Write an enzyme that holds these catalytic residues in place. Sequence first.
Site, mmCIF file in Angstrom:
data_model
loop_
_atom_site.group_PDB
_atom_site.id
_atom_site.type_symbol
_atom_site.label_atom_id
_atom_site.label_comp_id
_atom_site.label_asym_id
_atom_site.label_seq_id
_atom_site.Cartn_x
_atom_site.Cartn_y
_atom_site.Cartn_z
ATOM 1 N N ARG A 125 0.823 -1.225 0.000
ATOM 2 C CA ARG A 125 0.000 0.000 0.000
ATOM 3 C C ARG A 125 0.859 1.279 0.000
ATOM 4 O O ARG A 125 0.754 2.092 0.924
ATOM 5 C CB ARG A 125 -0.944 0.003 1.214
ATOM 6 C CG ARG A 125 -1.592 -1.346 1.521
ATOM 7 C CD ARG A 125 -1.543 -1.665 3.015
ATOM 8 N NE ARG A 125 -2.680 -1.108 3.746
ATOM 9 C CZ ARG A 125 -2.806 -1.118 5.072
ATOM 10 N NH1 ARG A 125 -1.862 -1.648 5.838
ATOM 11 N NH2 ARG A 125 -3.887 -0.597 5.636
ATOM 12 N N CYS A 132 0.569 -23.204 1.681
ATOM 13 C CA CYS A 132 0.926 -22.276 2.754
ATOM 14 C C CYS A 132 1.632 -22.928 3.924
ATOM 15 O O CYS A 132 1.067 -23.792 4.589
ATOM 16 C CB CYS A 132 -0.308 -21.534 3.270
ATOM 17 S SG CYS A 132 0.106 -20.336 4.538
ATOM 18 N N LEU A 133 2.870 -22.511 4.170
ATOM 19 C CA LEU A 133 3.602 -22.974 5.349
ATOM 20 C C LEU A 133 3.037 -22.410 6.653
ATOM 21 O O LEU A 133 3.180 -23.030 7.718
ATOM 22 C CB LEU A 133 5.088 -22.608 5.232
ATOM 23 C CG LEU A 133 5.915 -23.350 4.176
ATOM 24 C CD1 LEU A 133 7.223 -22.592 3.899
ATOM 25 C CD2 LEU A 133 6.199 -24.758 4.615
ATOM 26 N N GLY A 134 2.399 -21.240 6.571
ATOM 27 C CA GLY A 134 1.767 -20.635 7.756
ATOM 28 C C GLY A 134 0.368 -21.128 8.103
ATOM 29 O O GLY A 134 -0.257 -20.592 9.011
ATOM 30 N N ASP A 169 -0.739 -9.375 5.354
ATOM 31 C CA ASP A 169 -1.935 -8.985 4.597
ATOM 32 C C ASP A 169 -3.035 -10.046 4.529
ATOM 33 O O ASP A 169 -4.209 -9.722 4.681
ATOM 34 C CB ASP A 169 -1.566 -8.472 3.204
ATOM 35 C CG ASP A 169 -1.026 -7.045 3.236
ATOM 36 O OD1 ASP A 169 -0.780 -6.486 2.144
ATOM 37 O OD2 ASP A 169 -0.860 -6.474 4.345
ATOM 38 N N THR A 170 -2.663 -11.305 4.316
ATOM 39 C CA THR A 170 -3.648 -12.388 4.295
ATOM 40 C C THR A 170 -4.433 -12.464 5.605
ATOM 41 O O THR A 170 -5.652 -12.531 5.579
ATOM 42 C CB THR A 170 -3.015 -13.772 4.074
ATOM 43 O OG1 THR A 170 -1.886 -13.912 4.953
ATOM 44 C CG2 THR A 170 -2.591 -13.953 2.628
HETATM 45 C C1 HEM Z 1 -5.525 -16.718 6.298
HETATM 46 C C2 HEM Z 1 -4.183 -16.583 6.250
HETATM 47 C C3 HEM Z 1 -3.304 -17.125 5.101
HETATM 48 C C4 HEM Z 1 -3.657 -17.423 3.840
HETATM 49 C C5 HEM Z 1 -5.060 -17.319 3.200
HETATM 50 C C6 HEM Z 1 -2.482 -17.877 3.130
HETATM 51 C C7 HEM Z 1 -2.454 -18.270 1.804
HETATM 52 C C8 HEM Z 1 -1.351 -18.739 1.128
HETATM 53 C C9 HEM Z 1 -1.337 -19.309 -0.215
HETATM 54 C C10 HEM Z 1 -2.556 -19.471 -1.159
HETATM 55 C C11 HEM Z 1 -0.072 -19.651 -0.494
HETATM 56 C C12 HEM Z 1 0.456 -20.308 -1.802
HETATM 57 C C13 HEM Z 1 0.632 -19.295 -2.934
HETATM 58 C C14 HEM Z 1 0.965 -19.965 -4.258
HETATM 59 O O1 HEM Z 1 0.848 -21.206 -4.400
HETATM 60 O O2 HEM Z 1 1.353 -19.243 -5.218
HETATM 61 C C15 HEM Z 1 0.735 -19.331 0.666
HETATM 62 C C16 HEM Z 1 2.087 -19.547 0.772
HETATM 63 C C17 HEM Z 1 2.904 -19.222 1.825
HETATM 64 N N1 HEM Z 1 2.500 -18.667 3.036
HETATM 65 FE FE1 HEM Z 1 0.517 -18.264 3.559
HETATM 66 N N2 HEM Z 1 -1.417 -17.829 4.008
HETATM 67 C C18 HEM Z 1 -1.880 -17.385 5.222
HETATM 68 C C19 HEM Z 1 -1.113 -17.218 6.351
HETATM 69 C C20 HEM Z 1 0.263 -17.316 6.418
HETATM 70 C C21 HEM Z 1 1.071 -17.083 7.600
HETATM 71 C C22 HEM Z 1 0.444 -16.694 8.958
HETATM 72 C C23 HEM Z 1 2.360 -17.246 7.264
HETATM 73 C C24 HEM Z 1 3.646 -17.137 8.132
HETATM 74 C C25 HEM Z 1 3.747 -16.312 9.176
HETATM 75 C C26 HEM Z 1 2.388 -17.621 5.863
HETATM 76 C C27 HEM Z 1 3.512 -17.910 5.142
HETATM 77 C C28 HEM Z 1 3.572 -18.472 3.888
HETATM 78 C C29 HEM Z 1 4.781 -18.915 3.225
HETATM 79 C C30 HEM Z 1 6.224 -18.875 3.777
HETATM 80 C C31 HEM Z 1 4.337 -19.422 1.853
HETATM 81 C C32 HEM Z 1 5.235 -20.005 0.740
HETATM 82 C C33 HEM Z 1 5.174 -21.528 0.677
HETATM 83 C C34 HEM Z 1 6.061 -21.969 -0.463
HETATM 84 O O3 HEM Z 1 6.174 -21.232 -1.471
HETATM 85 O O4 HEM Z 1 6.665 -23.059 -0.370
HETATM 86 N N3 HEM Z 1 1.101 -17.672 5.393
HETATM 87 N N4 HEM Z 1 -0.071 -18.776 1.633
#
Ligand code: HEM
Length: 398
Positions: free
Chosen positions: A170, A341-343, A235-236
């Site tokens: 933003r 998603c790792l998170g 942001d998510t």
């Molecule tokens: C409602 C909350 C969340 C949603 C909806 C979400 C959604 C996603 C999605 C859809 C992806 C895959 C994107 C792709 O395939 O191109 C992703 C990847 C990832 N997310 Fe989240 N996420 C959330 C929370 C978090 C949190 C809390 C963390 C860490 C503090 C996190 C860390 C990551 C990381 C490190 C990846 C990369 C995984 C990889 O590329 O191997 N996410 N997330």
Amino acid sequence: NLAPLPPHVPEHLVFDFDMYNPSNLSAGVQEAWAVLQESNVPDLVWTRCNGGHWIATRGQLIREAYEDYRHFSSECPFIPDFIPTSMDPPEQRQFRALANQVVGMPVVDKLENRIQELACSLIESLRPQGQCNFTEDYAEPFPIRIFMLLAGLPEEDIPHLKYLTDQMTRPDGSMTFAEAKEALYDYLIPIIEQRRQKPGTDAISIVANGQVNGRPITSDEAKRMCGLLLVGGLDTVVNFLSFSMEFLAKSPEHRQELIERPERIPAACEELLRRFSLVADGRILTSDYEFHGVQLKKGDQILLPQMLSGLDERENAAPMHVDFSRQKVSHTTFGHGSHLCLGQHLARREIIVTLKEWLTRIPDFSIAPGAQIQHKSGIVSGVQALPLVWDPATTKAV
Ligand code: HEM
């Protein structure tokens, strides 16, 4: 504004959907995207908006493409340098394994009550006011403080770190994306160097001291990983908590259900993740490929909206209806395939803890009278603001 139709794309597949400004936005963002799922819209379309790109509109196709990383590569994940978001397997597996040591299920179980104490102190500071902008007053401060906890970082650094990440999604104009990223790197680099020498049990210390391909992780690799761990959960989470609290504010009967049946809160979390899914990422074709009768060309971009799978009526009956008792909740809200998603475990606990603590302390709340809630659309869709009101006499300090 429209790019000219590439010659390999047949006219009958053209539907000019703009993922940054969908025509039905004022009806709500999920509703606006679900236009793609009307019965006259093929499962695979081309839009001339935003450079021109494919959109898969059905859960089956979205899943399949995310599985097939050999044809659908993450090297170009956005329409129109963090690790591991831009890597295909097998290099991705290394960094993914390391990141999992910092945000995986065992870590989440260790921090659950720290997450709760943070939620409690935030809600308690708002409770006697009888009003807040939820997005601004709870949703934004919550995940950034969880990161400071994970990373062993001092409270005094929040304002500046928060500013840096705000500039990435933003921008106010003070900084380019590249400048914000490097400032973020200027911050992380010495901490990483120092914790190579004197490690703690925090996320930076673990990532800093990790192994990839025989030898130590570089500082370049550690910084770009720590960077993604920071921005991935902001942001998510901010926006997801906002869609959920908006719905609960507008549906006193769903509030009551979770008040009376707190054991249903984890199922409710899952059904909210389906209904208010918010991410739309994509992939790039590695080669010419015929996918379900459609000729895709090497280098074509394809949007595979994680948001759409759970909204698909082929996946969940009456998909716009929120029903905490669904036998089968089908979605790809955290993605699918090797980049899942790792998170996801941290996020679910954040959501569950938030709902439990908010409903305990402020069970009755509404949208502020006269307020119209506005959604925004993008790679991560969201809520502009969420003015909420309550009567302090119906709340409790716990
Ligand atoms: C409602 C909350 C969340 C949603 C909806 C979400 C959604 C996603 C999605 C859809 C992806 C895959 C994107 C792709 O395939 O191109 C992703 C990847 C990832 N997310 Fe989240 N996420 C959330 C929370 C978090 C949190 C809390 C963390 C860490 C503090 C996190 C860390 C990551 C990381 C490190 C990846 C990369 C995984 C990889 O590329 O191997 N996410 N997330």
